[PDB]
Design a binder for these strands. Structure first.
Ligand SMILES: [Mg+2]
Ligand SMILES: [Mg+2]
Ligand SMILES: [Mg+2]
Ligand SMILES: [Mg+2]
Ligand SMILES: [Mg+2]
Ligand SMILES: [Mg+2]
Length: 59
RNA sequence: UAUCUGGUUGAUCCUGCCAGUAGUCAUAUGCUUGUCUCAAAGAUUAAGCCAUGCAUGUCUAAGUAUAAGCAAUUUAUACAGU
């Protein structure tokens, strides 16, 4: 028996990987593939203006 | 910038203290008090107690920002502005 929303509904991860190695771990890409391509960008709205926030991929 | 006088007796000269005397960046306290300038101030009694508040935090082009923070527009879909 699934309890209301604890097992039924899911809350996603707040953050994505910050380190390049960590990023690689998240997908499984190997050295050649590079970063940039698979970064979790957040898109925030003030009210009318919609803008973007992206992680600084250290290392 | 080294100063003495009153008090022992009927008077005397002393020895002596006592009293005055002058000061204190030494306290208190009493009246009093308009003015500038400079300003000590719970040491002394109990290093006794303590309500409340404050008395140490710090960021630069240059350690760490996906603030679901602000910004917002004529460097971005890697970051690059506070
Ligand atoms: Mg770096
Ligand atoms: Mg005699
Ligand atoms: Mg006489
Ligand atoms: Mg005297
Ligand atoms: Mg005047
Ligand atoms: Mg005391």
């Amino acid at each position: 028996q699934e309890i209301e929303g604890i097992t039924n509904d899911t809350v996603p991860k707040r953050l994505g990987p910050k380190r390049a190695n960590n990023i690689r771990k998240f997908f499984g890409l190997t050295k050649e593939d590079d970063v940039r391509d698979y970064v979790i960008r957040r898109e925030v709205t003030k009210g009318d203006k919609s803008y973007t926030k992206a992680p600084k991929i250290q290392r």
